[PDB]
Design a protein around this ligand. Structure first.
Ligand SMILES: *C(=O)/C=C/N[C@@H](C(=O)O)[C@](C)(Cn1cc[n+](C)n1)S(=O)O
Length: 266
């Protein structure tokens, strides 16, 4: 929609921001987009694909969800609330760490999973395995979020990531049970109350994973169900001159622009 494009460009101009958006249907067909194939830093949005990789290994038997991953204080990095709470106990299970990574964006738990799957190269291999030739993880937390201008490390594009989301949730990447679990984790996410879902109607089923990077990166990827119609969505923004609250409001505004499009396309 032309209103969709114009409204996003008005936000970009007035907030000195770039907004990358892709909305795809369950089969990956494009519904709408803006700067869809511009690369943006993934920031913590990769933790959703990371959990998907873990569930695939659980599905295949190469990982077990209740396996205990032991660690010491060396695994604590900034914003590791669950990892800090479980530190005295000495471990988190595979599933606990994945849920912490998805629902709290726990950075220590993310690095703990990376230790167990083979590091950033293994995450990138999983993207390639499910047909995403674009998304790439080059580093662990926190440095993967440095978001140095122009750096192609640790990037994706809105369209590639939206199609990856659709493959994971609708395209058979996971068993029905693992798909349902990761869906519920996304709905129950604790970090997205002020971002995309704040801009969507309150009767839409929404689940998503946020990201924040230095140099003004603020992202939110996931899915929404509007009545019976399911969509996958990826939103990446760069707004160096906005405050953190204003960046939250920007993503929520993008959610409203998406909503106007979806409501009118009926
Ligand atoms: C996912 O997007 C992870 C984000 N990490 C950021 C952030 O939350 O903005 C960190 C935690 C930056 N930060 C904020 C406060 N402190 C002490 N560090 S970091 O891992 O870059």
């Amino acid at each position: 929609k032309l209103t969709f494009k114009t409204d996003l460009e008005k936000l970009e101009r007035e907030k000195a921001a770039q907004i990358g958006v892709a909305i795809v249907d369950p089969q990956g067909e494009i519904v709408a987009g803006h700067r869809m194939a511009q690369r943006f830093a993934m920031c913590s949005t990769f933790k959703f694909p990371l959990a998907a990789l873990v569930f695939e290994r659980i599905d295949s038997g190469t990982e077990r969800g209740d396996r205990k991953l032991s660690y010491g204080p060396d695994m604590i990095v900034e914003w590791s609330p669950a990892t800090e709470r479980f530190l005295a106990s000495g471990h988190m299970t595979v599933l606990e760490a994945a849920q912490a990574a998805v629902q709290l964006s726990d950075n220590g738990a993310t690095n703990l999973l990376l230790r167990e799957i083979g590091g950033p190269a293994a995450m990138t291999q999983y993207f390639r395995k499910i047909g995403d030739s674009v998304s790439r993880l080059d580093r662990k937390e926190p440095e993967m979020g440095d978001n140095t201008p122009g750096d192609l490390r640790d990037t994706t594009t809105p369209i590639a990531m939206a199609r990856t989301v659709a493959k994971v949730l609708y395209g058979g990447a996971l068993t029905s049970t693992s798909t349902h679990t990761i869906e519920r984790w996304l709905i129950g996410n604790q970090t997205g109350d002020a971002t995309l879902r704040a801009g969507f109607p309150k009767d839409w089923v929404v689940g998503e994973k946020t990201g924040t990077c230095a140099n003004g990166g603020r992202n939110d990827i996931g899915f929404f169900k509007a009545q019976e119609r399911d969509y996958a969505v990826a939103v990446y923004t760069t707004a160096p001159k906005l405050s953190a609250v204003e960046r939250d409001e920007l993503v929520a505004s993008v959610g409203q622009v998406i909503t106007q499009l979806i409501l009118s396309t009926d």
